[PDB]
Write a protein that binds this ligand. Structure first.
Ligand SMILES: Nc1ncnc2c1ncn2[C@@H]1O[C@H](COP(=O)(O)OP(=O)(O)OP(O)(O)=S)[C@@H](O)[C@H]1O
Ligand SMILES: Nc1ncnc2c1ncn2[C@@H]1O[C@H](COP(=O)(O)OP(=O)(O)OP(O)(O)=S)[C@@H](O)[C@H]1O
Ligand SMILES: *[C@@H]1O[C@H](CO)[C@@H](O[C@@H]2O[C@H](CO)[C@@H](O)[C@H](O)[C@H]2NC(C)=O)[C@H](O)[C@H]1NC(C)=O
Ligand SMILES: *[C@@H]1O[C@H](CO)[C@@H](O[C@@H]2O[C@H](CO)[C@@H](O)[C@H](O)[C@H]2NC(C)=O)[C@H](O)[C@H]1NC(C)=O
Ligand SMILES: *[C@@H]1O[C@H](CO)[C@@H](O)[C@H](O)[C@H]1NC(C)=O
Ligand SMILES: *[C@@H]1O[C@H](CO)[C@@H](O)[C@H](O)[C@H]1NC(C)=O
Ligand SMILES: *[C@@H]1O[C@H](CO)[C@@H](O)[C@H](O)[C@H]1NC(C)=O
Ligand SMILES: *[C@@H]1O[C@H](CO)[C@@H](O)[C@H](O)[C@H]1NC(C)=O
Length: 1804
């Protein structure tokens, strides 16, 4: 059991070692992919980012100075690691060291002090002020700045406008700020409705800009107070310079920047016009509830007024996209980038929403609410950003499968190859169980897999791809994967019966099972938990599911290790060990599947007796052996009771189908006997089992050798397997090697270098165990007769002792070697015995014939006198045949009769006698039928016409296939167009209702500071009851404690620490220690320790958090909220989006009443102006001082990952304020405000880019058209490939056909066939009303493009007919290649077009400039280009043409240029090719006979590497009036000479001339008069035979009116009347041969060539061929016939030439040969002594001529000079003594037998 496994493993290792280039490629292919992966890793290392905090943004409602301060200082949005002062519940401002704030505080305190006082005291107070000094220093600055923006930033933290432009264009930061401010400074507010209510709303919009325009009055009062004081009496210059600077800034002010529009269409037109001038900024639409014109939204929520809907339309390049709520790829980032994401800050959307909402509340409420709104960004933890790990999670299975596709292909190829040559059956014959075979396969294939896995593990660990992990677990994963994939490859090898088919399908079967993993990862959340395990039954799917868990565990900073093998890293991911368990279960299931499937198709591979020897020792005793198959009710083998005997070489006789090899397999260990017994050596076959193998040898009818192992390893392997010991193999090896004469070959150790002799070696293998019984099976099945002598010598060498049982098809072989013969025919035995006994039992006797150049009764009386027995069988004139009695036949009587007849020859006028001994052939036949009975220019026009007709009939023969290949794609396209009538989603921007409720269930805040006020209490009530909470606040007091219970294990930790809310209460948080990377921060159990009070309303949770830290709580709690949905990381639903803090502390000085009183007192005094301008200024100042209190504020925290959170929460705040200031009652339900977002249409320049991303249905239609359009050329080319496989094409070429004209005819017919599908597609497009195609300016372009693409595509794959030789696979491969090329081109172009965000891809347009050289992509590009150009034209002017040579003209021109070059290439590819014997050779050399039709001279062929000429130095001459014949054994070179003379092949040396026209010098006239007939059937099965006949008739040039009549003649000479109507496909075996003969004969060629015209068909067919050839030979025409059957050559031909080894031998007429050497007699002696000298000596002494023939041990034949003067009897009497003189049992004489010419044919 172990020795067989060792031998199998050694053999497999030897196969692998003898291929020293496949191992290297298998090792170095998977390393390339992983080196690419390592390079990719080196390209993108992970990025690290620490914690950072964000400042606050003040809305204009809070103030104007802080507003500009924010717009000028917080533009960069830089992170700050330290906590910002704004976040703390106390402060509400960030800038405390700013000059503006200090100046305002100093002014306030000085004014308060002055008011309290009411000069020296005031001067002293103002002297100690650094802010005034800083302001004076800033005023006294000699430029030093790029522009006023820099000075404004330093202070805070028209031709004049042209000068400002010139100054500000220099500084890049000033450029950025100026770009941000340009839309808004020069803005043009527009509104559609002009009703008075809207007028009041825009009056509320006015009042802000009116407050803005107040510096003019203060300025003018300054210059009207200036000169007065100056006349009454550095500071004066500084104020004037400052005032003039202020005036210059206000010079480039829009002032009246508000405008109006009459209607929505006019609104859009005016907006686009202003965009053309770069002046448009925003537009507002006050849609009314009663209008009911709501696109994709409800008309009105409640009847009547009270609800205001407001739409803001701005430029798309400014307002963010408004289609999807969230990003599709979650990123570990704060999502705070001013340039890209923070668009609402420099876009002004929030500003205008605030302004409009405040106007609406001030109008509807009827009060003047004051509440400053601020915006804050929640802070974000420290993080590591690394996209690569998700890429591994999604990519690693792909690279692993691509690395292991190669070894799987090799494994399946090897398994199928070894199971193809039936070697497995031979191994099972010797006794090896299938289990050992499969175990050898397992352990031999599984080595390289694990070596590759180990190398991959080392690469992964060392290459930093999977660090922080222990390689042991990774290896235990890859090993399970390798086991599963090897088992599944063995399963894949169990469905195929061909080598290359299995090799090319196994890789595809392995790769096609990785797609479901992608399908599952796309809809990751869709699939439940139940279907996960069911889908993970595939091996690659399970590997992917395990790889995702491995990557997920890698993200958490601790890789795969022994600690966490059985731990699930997330609630819905497999543990790493469970995946391996499933992998092993899958491998076991695949193994069981292979085991069961191997048994699905079992079995099928895909009374005369002479028993009396001197020693009766029945070594093999088979009795009544029977077997039956279910294929036929009659048994495969019937009763066979024959008994064999040791020492005799029994043999089997029968024609193929006699069930001999079946029985020989029964006796071996391959098949089971159904009945009877098969006792070998005494013990039954099954009982012996393994007790019989050393004493039983088998050799099968197929050669059994390994193409890589040498001879010595071969004998070693086949000896050690039988039971031989390793010590005694040397002598046995040497014995067999010396016996077979391979002692030289074992020196070079080759197996595939030597051929033909290999069968000999196989025979020797049957004699390696010295087994007593040996069963051979046709040891000379196919070996050349020239080498059967060695096999005969070896088999006779081992003829003693061993029982040998063989079987041969022949009849001569069964008597040379065999000591006995039994005849089996029709699966049954008929007779048995020995050749002597078989020849001694006949109805007839021993024949004697006499010819005439006297009297029958006289000769009969003479014969009866000389011998009593005599039978008269034949009595016709000119030959008298009598039967001499075999019963009691004696030599003396025959000798006396012959001696008497010798003298009386002249008188009797006989002049010749012929004796005859019955032979084995006729007795074999007679017993076979006895057993059978007992069982029961105009010519070119006609040529093209005929070719087109034959193509049309060829198409009409196969109509269903062409119909399904042509019409079906059109119906497919039509159905695709029908089903594509749904609304196309392309990315339009609908109307979106911007409210917080769109996000869904969430958690929100209501933090409050300084709650000591009733108005703030009302505002808080509005905020809470706005979200759906219960109306009475006291109910919350009824709920009392509404918080989750604190964790018990955390209470002790809290008691350990201070736990004050102001101090950091939570414990610290883990982060990146440098040696380890964590994606989130791992949260402890104490983050924001006390669970804050939460109340749930209607799908929403509100939390208190009053008085806590807030920032710390959010930073600590965020990852806990996120992690619930990081398993898939596709659409992450953050739960906390925003919240409110009711801050109340006033950063400014609240004491503004005193300042107002002081201003009023100053207004009363100082001579107020009668006009009141100063009075109005002072009133405005008093109002500003009164409003300076800022009684209540509000801050909104928002999360930026939700795109539309800022606007939703600002809307909520405004609505809450409105509901707060409205008096209580049911009227609260009547009032509401709504805000929408709707970007405007694209401008023309914007359209020129935006039209690109509106093509999905177009892409689908183009893909469908390309897929359905690339089928026809393959259908065209399959027919040509099929006609190339058969040599019928060349048969056409000997007609009038030329290859160029054949190509032209095929091209024209395929054009005519192709013109229909294009018309069908065109009519489908026209009938289905596609505006994209039914336009009159688009139809001609589409038609021309389709027709010219079909023009160009066809000659692409015509040159491919030479490469392939089978129709179906050629069609499949060509279709797949074309579809792959088209789809890849289209996808690459569309991907580069959509993803062309960066500029270095637009130059990739040159790539398409190359694709015009590819003809398949021209149509796909042209359709898309035409569609986009025409759609742009439709959308351009309504709200240049396809025929122009700018969109499709260039592509069409390039493709029509490409058209003819492929036809030229295939036309050039077609024409790529550019003693009697001595006396007749001498007469040919000296001169040429003019009458001879064919003349040859030194005809020679030298193949490549054969080292010997197949046909060498061949000469001949054929007179026209005689039929020729060529003879030779297989391998002589007759077919090579036939091909060379016909012209299908070239000649290495020498040329043959036919009727004075050499083949090379001008082939056309040569082929005009040659009738080609090969052994193969060169016909088209689709057509009919008669149709072939008229096709050849029309090609030749027969007039049409007689062509049909010719058909009758074309059958009248060869019958064919019953088979005329039937198609050529459904005929008989000989019908094809006779049809080929008729096609050769039709047309009346001068000479007719036939290669093996008849090979064992019905006698009627050969009689008809005989008649046809006789006709053509006595009508004065010549035939060159090649055959084997000698009687046909005798009957038909008049000259015979015999050739062996490529050279003539006799070259004479049949009668000349018969008289030259086939006369006399030959003697055969049966000597058992096997001694040459005793038999040779006396024969040479008495007879001068004793030439040897087949000198073997059993028999020897004698050649002697003919024409003995004495009688023939002169030998017989001598033999009558010679039996005593020398050992001779019996004898035979062949004296002018019917087999003399046969004997010479077999002689040489
Ligand atoms: N797959 C099969 N293989 C062999 N024999 C079959 C098969 N199917 C049916 N038979 C039976 O085989 C008989 C016909 O002779 P075969 O057994 O095929 O001859 P054979 O053994 O191939 O002949 P030789 O002369 O020994 S090569 C009929 O009884 C068939 O029904
Ligand atoms: N691929 C090949 N095709 C044809 N002949 C070949 C090929 N390879 C070698 N030969 C030579 O063909 C010769 C043996 O076949 P031939 O005598 O030419 O014809 P044939 O086998 O008698 O023809 P049939 O009767 O039509 S199968 C030897 O010279 C071979 O070396
Ligand atoms: C949020 O927390 C505060 C505590 O700061 C709760 O205020 C209490 O409310 C009840 C009911 O109105 C009063 O009787 C208590 O006197 C309040 N306590 C203090 C110390 O303020 C408040 O109820 C909680 N939620 C709400 C409804 O705002
Ligand atoms: C701006 O876009 C709107 C669509 O949002 C266009 O209005 C539609 O125009 C089509 C004609 O092309 C009509 O069939 C629709 O009924 C219109 N819908 C609406 C809502 O009116 C509008 O024509 C575009 N204007 C410009 C100048 O591009
Ligand atoms: C923002 O800060 C970065 C810090 O490097 C600086 O390089 C950049 O110029 C700043 N940009 C603006 C707009 O201030
Ligand atoms: C602002 O600065 C002043 C003067 O240094 C200081 O008294 C005051 O406490 C500061 N206030 C804040 C908000 O830090
Ligand atoms: C105020 O807005 C109104 C629209 O109601 C507009 O007519 C007017 O010009 C604006 N005021 C000024 C002077 O800009
Ligand atoms: C909040 O927590 C932070 C954590 O650094 C701490 O520095 C800060 O003092 C705390 N502030 C309050 C008022 O809770």
């Amino acid at each position: 059991f172990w020795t067989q496994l060792m031998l199998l493993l050694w053999k497999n290792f030897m196969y692998r070692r003898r291929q020293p280039v496949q191992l290297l490629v298998e090792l170095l292919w998977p390393l390339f992919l992983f080196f690419i992966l390592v390079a990719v890793r080196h390209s993108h290392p992970p990025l690290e980012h620490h914690e950072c905090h964000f400042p606050n943004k003040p809305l204009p409602s809070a103030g104007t100075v802080p507003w500009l301060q924010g717009l000028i200082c917080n533009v960069n949005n830089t992170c700050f690691p330290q906590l910002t002062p704004g976040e703390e519940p106390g402060r509400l401002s960030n800038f405390n060291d700013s000059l503006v704030s200090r100046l305002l505080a100093d002014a306030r305190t000085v004014l308060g002090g002055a008011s309290a006082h009411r000069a020296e005291d005031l001067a002293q107070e103002l002297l100690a002020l650094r802010s005034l000094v800083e302001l004076r220093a800033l005023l006294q600055r000699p430029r030093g700045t790029s522009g006023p923006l820099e000075l404004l930033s330093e202070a805070l933290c028209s031709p004049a406008c042209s000068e400002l432009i010139g100054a500000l264009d220099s500084h890049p930061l000033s450029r950025l700020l100026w770009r941000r401010l340009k839309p808004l400074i020069l803005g043009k507010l527009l509104f559609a409705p002009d009703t008075p209510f809207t007028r009041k709303l825009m009056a509320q919009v006015n009042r802000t800009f009116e407050e803005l325009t107040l510096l003019r009055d203060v300025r003018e009062v300054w210059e009207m107070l200036g000169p007065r004081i100056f006349t009454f009496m550095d500071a004066h210059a500084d104020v004037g310079h400052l005032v003039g600077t202020l005036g210059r800034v206000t010079e480039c002010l829009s002032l009246d920047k508000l405008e109006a529009a009459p209607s929505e269409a006019a609104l859009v037109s005016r907006a686009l016009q202003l965009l053309a001038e770069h002046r448009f900024w925003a537009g507002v639409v006050f849609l009314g509830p009663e209008d009911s014109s709501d696109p994709t939204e409800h008309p009105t929520p409640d009847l009547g007024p009270g609800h205001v809907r407001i739409k803001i339309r701005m430029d798309i390049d400014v307002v963010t996209r408004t289609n999807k709520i969230r990003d599709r790829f979650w990123d570990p980032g704060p999502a705070a980038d001013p340039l890209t994401d923070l668009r609402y800050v420099w876009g002004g959307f929030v500003y205008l929403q605030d302004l409009v909402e405040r106007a609406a509340v001030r109008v509807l409420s009827g009060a003047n609410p004051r509440a400053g709104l601020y915006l804050q960004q929640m802070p974000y933890p420290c993080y590591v950003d690394d996209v690569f790990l998700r890429v591994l999670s999604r990519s690693l299975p792909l690279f692993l499968t691509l690395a292991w596709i190669y070894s799987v292909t090799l494994t399946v190829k090897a398994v199928v190859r070894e199971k193809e040559t039936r070697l497995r059956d031979t191994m099972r014959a010797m006794g090896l169980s299938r289990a050992v075979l499969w175990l050898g396969w397992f352990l031999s294939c599984l080595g390289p897999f694990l070596l590759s896995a180990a190398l991959l593990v080392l690469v992964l660990k060392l290459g930093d791809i999977l660090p922080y992990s222990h390689p042991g677990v990774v290896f235990l994963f890859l090993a399970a994967f390798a086991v599963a994939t090897v088992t599944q490859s063995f399963l894949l090898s169990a469905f195929f019966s061909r080598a290359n088919l299995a090799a090319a399908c196994g890789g595809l079967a392995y790769f096609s099972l990785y797609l479901p993993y992608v399908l599952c990862v796309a809809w990751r959340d869709r699939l439940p938990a139940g279907g996960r395990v069911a889908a993970s039954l595939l091996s690659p799917v399970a590997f992917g599911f395990g790889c995702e868990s491995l990557a997920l565990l890698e993200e958490q900073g601790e890789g795969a290790q022994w600690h966490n093998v059985g731990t699930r890293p997330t609630a819905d991911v497999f543990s790493l060990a469970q995946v391996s368990g499933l992998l092993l279960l899958d491998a076991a299931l695949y193994g069981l599947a292979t085991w069961y499937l191997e048994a699905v198709c079992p079995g099928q591979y895909g009374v005369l007796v002479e028993e009396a020897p001197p020693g009766l020792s029945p070594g093999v005793s088979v009795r009544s052996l029977e077997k039956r198959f279910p294929g036929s009710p009659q048994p495969a083998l019937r009763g066979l009771s024959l008994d064999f005997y040791q020492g005799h070489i029994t043999a089997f006789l029968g024609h193929n189908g006699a069930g001999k090899t079946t029985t020989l397999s029964i006796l071996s260990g391959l098949f089971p006997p159904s009945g009877g017994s098969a006792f070998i050596l005494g013990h039954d076959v099954r009982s012996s089992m393994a007790a019989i193998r050393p004493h039983l040898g088998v050799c099968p009818q197929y050669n059994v050798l390994f193409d890589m192992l040498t001879v010595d390893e071969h004998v070693w392997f086949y000896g050690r397997l039988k039971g031989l010991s390793a010590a005694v193999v040397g002598p046995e090896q040497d014995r067999l090697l010396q016996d077979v004469g391979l002692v030289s070959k074992q020196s070079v150790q080759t197996r595939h270098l030597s051929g033909g002799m290999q069968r000999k070696l196989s025979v020797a293998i049957a004699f390696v165990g010295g087994s007593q019984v040996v069963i051979l099976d046709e040891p000379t099945a196919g070996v050349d007769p020239a080498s059967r002598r060695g096999i005969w010598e070896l088999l006779l060498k081992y003829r003693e002792g061993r029982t040998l049982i063989l079987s041969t098809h022949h009849l001569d072989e069964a008597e040379l070697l065999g000591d006995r013969v039994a005849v089996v025919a029709g699966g049954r035995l008929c007779c048995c015995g020995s050749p002597l006994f078989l020849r001694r039992h006949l109805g007839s006797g021993y024949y004697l014939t006499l010819v005439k150049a006297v009297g029958t009764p006289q000769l009969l009386a003479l014969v009866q006198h000389w011998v009593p027995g005599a039978r008269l069988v034949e009595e016709l004139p000119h030959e008298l045949v009598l039967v001499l009695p075999y019963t009691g036949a004696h030599d003396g009587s025959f000798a006396t009769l012959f001696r008497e007849l010798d003298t009386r020859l002249a008188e009797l006028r006989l002049t010749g006698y012929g004796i005859s001994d019955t032979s084995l052939e006729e007795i074999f036949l007679k017993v076979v039928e006895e057993c059978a009975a007992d069982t029961d220019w105009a010519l070119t026009r006609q040529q093209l016409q005929a070719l087109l007709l034959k193509r049309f009939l060829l198409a009409r023969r196969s109509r269903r296939g062409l119909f399904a290949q042509i019409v079906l794609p059109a119906l497919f396209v039509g159905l695709a167009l029908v089903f594509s009538l749904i609304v196309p989603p392309f990315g339009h921007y609908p109307a979106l209702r911007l409210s917080p409720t769109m996000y869904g269930a969430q958690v929100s805040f209501f933090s409050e500071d300084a709650p000591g006020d009733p108005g703030r209490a009302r505002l808080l009530e509005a905020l809470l009851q706005e979200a759906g909470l219960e109306e009475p606040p006291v109910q919350h007091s009824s709920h009392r404690f509404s918080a989750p219970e604190v964790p018990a294990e955390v209470a002790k930790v809290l008691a350990s620490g201070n736990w004050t809310p102001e101090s950091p209460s939570p414990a610290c948080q883990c982060s990146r220690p440098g040696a380890r990377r964590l994606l989130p921060d791992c949260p402890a159990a104490a983050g924001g320790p006390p669970p804050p009070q939460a109340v749930t309303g209607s799908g929403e949770v509100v939390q208190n958090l009053t008085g806590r830290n807030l920032s710390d709580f959010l930073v600590k709690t965020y990852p806990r909220l996120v992690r619930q949905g990081l398993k898939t990381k596709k659409w992450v639903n953050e739960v906390r989006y925003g919240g409110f803090s009711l801050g109340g502390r006033d950063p400014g000085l609240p004491s503004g009443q005193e300042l107002g009183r002081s201003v009023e007192e100053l207004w009363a005094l100082l001579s107020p102006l009668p006009g009141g301008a100063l009075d109005r200024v002072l009133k405005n100042l008093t109002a500003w001082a009164h409003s300076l209190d800022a009684q209540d504020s509000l801050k909104i925290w928002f999360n930026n990952k939700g795109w539309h959170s800022m606007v939703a929460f600002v809307n909520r705040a405004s609505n809450a304020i409105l509901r707060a200031h409205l008096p209580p009652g049911p009227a609260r339900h009547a009032h509401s405000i709504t805000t929408l977002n709707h970007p405007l249409n694209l401008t023309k320049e914007q359209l020129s880019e935006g039209a690109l991303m509106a093509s999905s249905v177009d892409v689908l239609v183009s893909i469908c058209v390309v897929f359905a359009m690339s089928f026809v050329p393959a259908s065209f080319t399959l027919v040509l490939i099929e006609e190339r496989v058969t040599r019928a094409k060349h048969l056409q070429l000997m007609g009038g056909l030329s290859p160029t004209l054949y190509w032209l005819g095929n091209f024209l017919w395929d054009m005519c066939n192709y013109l229909v599908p294009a018309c069908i597609v065109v009519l489908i497009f026209l009938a289905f009303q596609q505006r994209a195609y039914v336009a009159p300016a688009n139809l001609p372009a589409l038609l021309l493009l389709l027709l010219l693409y079909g023009w160009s595509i066809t000659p692409l794959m015509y040159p491919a007919s030479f490469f392939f030789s089978v129709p179906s696979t050629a069609y499949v491969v060509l279709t797949c290649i074309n579809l792959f090329i088209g789809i890849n081109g289209s996808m690459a172009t569309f991907v580069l077009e959509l993803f062309s965000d960066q500029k270095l891809q637009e130059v990739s347009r040159i790539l398409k400039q190359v694709f015009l050289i590819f003809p398949h992509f021209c149509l796909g590009r042209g359709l898309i280009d035409m569609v986009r150009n025409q759609a742009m034209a439709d959308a351009f002017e309504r709200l240049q043409s396809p025929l122009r040579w700018e969109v499709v003209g260039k592509n069409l021109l390039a493709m029509v240029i490409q058209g003819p070059l492929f036809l030229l290439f295939t036309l050039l590819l077609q024409h790529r090719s550019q003693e009697d014997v001595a006396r007749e050779r001498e007469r040919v050399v000296q001169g040429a006979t003019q009458g001879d039709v064919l003349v040859l001279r030194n005809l020679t062929k030298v193949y490549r590497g054969q080292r010997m000429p197949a046909v060498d130095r061949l000469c001949l001459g054929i007179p026209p009036g005689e039929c020729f014949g060529l003879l030779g054994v297989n391998g002589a070179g007759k077919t090579s000479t036939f091909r060379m003379v016909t012209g299908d092949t070239l000649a290495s040396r020498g040329e043959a001339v036919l009727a004075g026209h050499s083949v090379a010098r001008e082939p056309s006239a040569a082929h005009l008069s040659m009738g080609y007939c090969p052994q193969s059937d060169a016909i088209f099965e689709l057509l009919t035979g008669r149709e072939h006949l008229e096709l050849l008739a029309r090609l030749r040039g027969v007039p049409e009116a007689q062509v049909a009549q010719t058909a009758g003649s074309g059958l009248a000479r060869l019958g064919l009347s019953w088979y005329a109507d039937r198609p050529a496909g459904t005929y008989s075996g000989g019908n094809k041969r006779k049809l080929a003969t008729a096609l050769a004969l039709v047309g009346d060629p001068a000479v007719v060539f036939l290669d093996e015209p008849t090979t064992g068909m019905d006698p009627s067919a050969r009689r008809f061929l005989w008649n046809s050839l006789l006709a053509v030979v006595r009508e004065g025409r010549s035939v060159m016939l090649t055959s084997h059957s000698m009687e046909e050559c005798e009957a038909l031909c008049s000259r015979l030439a015999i050739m062996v080894n490529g050279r003539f031998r006799c070259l004479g007429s049949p009668q000349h040969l018969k008289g030259r050497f086939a006369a006399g007699h030959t003697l055969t002696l049966r000597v058992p002594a096997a001694r040459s000298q005793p038999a040779a000596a006396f024969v040479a002494a008495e007879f001068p001529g004793a030439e040897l023939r087949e000198a073997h041990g059993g028999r020897l034949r004698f050649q002697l000079p003919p024409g003995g003067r004495c009688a023939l009897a002169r030998v017989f009497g001598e033999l009558a003594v010679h039996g005593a003189e020398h050992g001779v049992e019996d004898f035979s004489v062949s004296q002018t037998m019917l087999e003399e010419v046969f004997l010479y044919f077999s002689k040489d």
